[PDB]
């Protein structure tokens, strides 16, 4: 159903990931198939109000990064200690 | 804002309305508004004694020629 | 509030509207005189046997003036009569105290015909099925 976009991670380690969460962004990863795990940054409040419907996990996803499209479903979610805001989410190719 | 005092008698804080201080002796509302903005005891007593307000639209400094100021 | 109500319920034997207790209190609170109501109630019951419960539906105007429709007895009274049950089970469907055929319901439906709103003799019957079901009666085709 839902049609999103993503960026590839410029810097990785604690300092870059804190500078995402300071600015209401969070990280994620897309694994599976014959091909490598793909690390991306996402925007928190773009996707938080999409994932209010179950089709973001149940039905397949349009995800565009550098004009590449592979088809995807969402996987399990990591949340902040005292906020329901998304600290990190995992995804699988579908 | 009820201008609180306890001169020495009767249980309670004692008080005075906001309404008296403009309706009766109308100078006092400005006097004890600039008062706390001045330094310690003695120099603020010399700063303070330079203000007069009088009753209102009845000032007596006609002969000094006051320079009007809008704030 | 204006104090108008459409379709006030009362259910009382035809021979029992001379005392106030078969009438209960509720007419009294809305300003319907129990004596005046008793002259209005005997005028459509003269062809019904005494002790047989008469349906009465009342409309009341702002000044507690009142108009009354008196009816031939309920489908429920006749459906109890026709199955040979004195009273129902107090559980619809799950408790059975008889059964009733469709042809009997059709004879009820025609006795009810001026009270019935239905566009069909079939429609009229369909209304009293669920009344039969309420009294612990099976409507078998």
């Amino acid at each position: 159903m839902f049609t999103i976009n993503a960026e590839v991670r410029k810097e990785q380690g604690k300092g870059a990931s804190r500078r995402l969460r300071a600015a209401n962004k969070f990280p994620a990863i897309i694994y599976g198939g014959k091909e490598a795990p793909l690390a991306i940054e996402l925007d928190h409040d773009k996707v938080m109000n999409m994932q209010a419907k179950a089709e973001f996990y149940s039905e397949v996803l349009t995800i565009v990064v550098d004009g590449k499209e592979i088809k995807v479903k969402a996987q399990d979610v990591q949340r902040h200690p005292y906020k329901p805001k998304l600290q990190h989410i995992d995804f699988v190719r579908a | 804002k009820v201008y609180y005092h306890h001169t020495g008698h009767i249980g309670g804080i004692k008080q005075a309305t906001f309404e008296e201080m403009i309706a009766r002796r109308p100078e006092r509302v400005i006097e004890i508004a600039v008062k706390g903005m001045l330094p310690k005891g003695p120099l603020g007593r010399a700063m303070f004694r330079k203000l007069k307000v009088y009753a209102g639209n009845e000032h007596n400094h006609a002969a000094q020629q006051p320079q009007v100021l809008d704030i | 509030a204006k104090k108008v109500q459409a379709y006030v319920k009362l259910q009382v034997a035809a021979g029992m509207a001379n005392p106030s207790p078969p009438v209960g209190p509720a007419l009294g609170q809305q300003g319907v005189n129990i004596m005046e109501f008793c002259k209005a109630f005997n005028a459509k019951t003269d062809s019904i046997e005494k002790g047989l419960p008469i349906p009465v539906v009342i409309t009341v105007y702002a000044d507690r003036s009142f108009t009354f429709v008196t009816k031939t007895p309920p489908a429920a009274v006749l459906l109890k009569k026709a199955a040979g049950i004195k009273s129902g089970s107090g559980k619809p469907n799950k408790d059975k105290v008889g059964k009733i055929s469709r042809a009997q319901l059709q004879e009820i439906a025609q006795t009810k015909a001026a009270d019935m709103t239905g566009a069909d003799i079939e429609a009229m019957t369909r209304s009293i099925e669920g009344t039969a079901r309420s009294m612990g009666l099976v409507v078998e085709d």
Binding site: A54, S58, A74, Q75, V77, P81 | - | -
Partner: protein, 136 residues
């Protein structure tokens, strides 16, 4: 109420938490109540919280309970000074820490499970927030 059957030793250290929990997501239920932050619970709340949820939900579904007061905690009597061995035994404590899910459900209809979980939270000494599982 949930508690450990028997314990290795009779007396243990009070402890503290380092600032994270590991059952922060719902994993027994399909929804639950999350602790927000941190504190102590005297086992009185476990009891009161199950009681609060069962009077509202009754025989529609199951409750899963995730807190148990595995740790003894002493009070030092008013007649006895400090530095003199630990006090008489006072209460048994479950330690909640940031993100710890307290109570979980599935069987009960979600909106009835939400009302039940608001009620348990009044029995608790701190503000809480309801969490839902989703697909993942």
């Amino acid at each position: 109420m949930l508690q450990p059957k028997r314990t290795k030793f009779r007396k243990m250290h009070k402890g503290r938490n380092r600032g994270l929990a590991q059952g922060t997501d719902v994993s027994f239920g399909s929804f639950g109540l999350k602790a927000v932050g941190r504190g102590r619970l005297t086992a009185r709340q476990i009891e009161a919280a199950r009681r609060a949820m069962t009077r509202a939900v009754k025989r529609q579904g199951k409750i899963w309970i995730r807190v148990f007061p595995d740790k003894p905690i002493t009070e030092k009597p008013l007649a006895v000074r400090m530095g003199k061995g630990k006090g008489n035994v006072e209460y048994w404590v479950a330690l909640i820490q940031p993100g710890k899910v307290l109570y979980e459900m599935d069987g009960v209809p979600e909106e009835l499970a939400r009302e039940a979980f608001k009620l348990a939270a009044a029995k608790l000494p701190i503000k809480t927030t309801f969490v839902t599982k989703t697909v993942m």
